[PDB]
Design a protein around this ligand. Structure first.
Ligand code: CL
Ligand code: CL
Ligand code: CL
Ligand code: CL
Ligand code: NA
Length: 129
């Protein structure tokens, strides 16, 4: 599924991401924009052989099982395919664990490079939320 901007903000708010670990909703929308262009089916292979999955491009090295990442962990206890669903619950629940891991949203390199310090509230402006 390719979400609309305000549609994702609304879904993310419902699943409890708004201000989760101090990160306003716009940070999460921005992160998803640049990770996946709001497409739940986004996948991208990493140089190390791991793969990134879903709207927030969660990686198989640590967080999900895809059966093809030697030596990796599955800390969200899910198949990486669950991160591709039109239903964002698995992605949100795993994002919550990742953002709690010590480095906050810096865990998402694109959030740090493209969202961090910017007017992130712009990503939710005009939305009924
Ligand atoms: Cl947009
Ligand atoms: Cl915001
Ligand atoms: Cl594996
Ligand atoms: Cl933080
Ligand atoms: Na894994």
């Amino acid at each position: 599924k390719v979400f609309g901007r305000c549609e994702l903000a609304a879904a993310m708010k419902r699943h409890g991401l708004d201000n989760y670990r101090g990160y306003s909703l716009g940070n999460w929308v921005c992160a998803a924009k640049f990770e996946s262009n709001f497409n739940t089916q986004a996948t991208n292979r990493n140089t190390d052989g791991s793969t990134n999955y879903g709207i927030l491009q969660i990686n198989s090295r640590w967080w999900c099982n895809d059966g093809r990442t030697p030596g990796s962990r599955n800390l969200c206890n899910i198949p990486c395919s669950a991160l591709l669903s039109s239903d964002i619950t698995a992605s949100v629940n795993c994002a919550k664990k990742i953002v709690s891991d010590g480095n906050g949203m810096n865990a998402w390199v694109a959030w740090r490079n493209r969202c961090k310090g910017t007017d992130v509230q712009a990503w939710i402006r005009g939305c009924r939320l």
